[PDB]
Amino acid sequence: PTTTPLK
Ligand SMILES: *[C@H]1O[C@H](CO)[C@H](O)[C@H](O)[C@H]1NC(C)=O
Ligand SMILES: *[C@H]1O[C@H](CO)[C@H](O)[C@H](O)[C@H]1NC(C)=O
């Protein structure tokens, strides 16, 4: 799994 640009 991955994650979207955390900002
Ligand atoms: C996590 O990042 C990867 C990089 O290709 C994919 O874009 C994936 O779809 C992402 N997962 C989510 C939940 O956005
Ligand atoms: C997505 O979020 C996760 C958890 O915070 C990680 O920081 C990961 O490095 C993030 N992905 C991107 C592409 O920044």
DSSP result, the chain: -------
Closest ligand 1 atom to 3 CA: 1
In the Cβ-directed half-sphere of 3, how many Cα atoms lie within 13 Å? 3
Q: Quick check: CB of 3 below 6 Å from ligand 2?
A: yes
Task: Look at the block and give the residue holding tokens 């640009």.
Answer: 5
Sequence positions preceding breaks in the chain, C–N over 2.5 Å: none
Look up residue 1 and give its amino acid: P
- Residue 1 structure tokens: 């799994």
Method: NMR
Count of H-run helices and E-run strands, the chain: 0, 0
Torsion angles phi and psi, residue 6, rounded to 5: -75, 115
- Residue 2 structure tokens: 């991955």
CA dist., res. 2 & res. 5, Å (int): 10
Pocket of ligand 1 (CB under 6 A): 2-4
- Residue 6 structure tokens: 């955390």
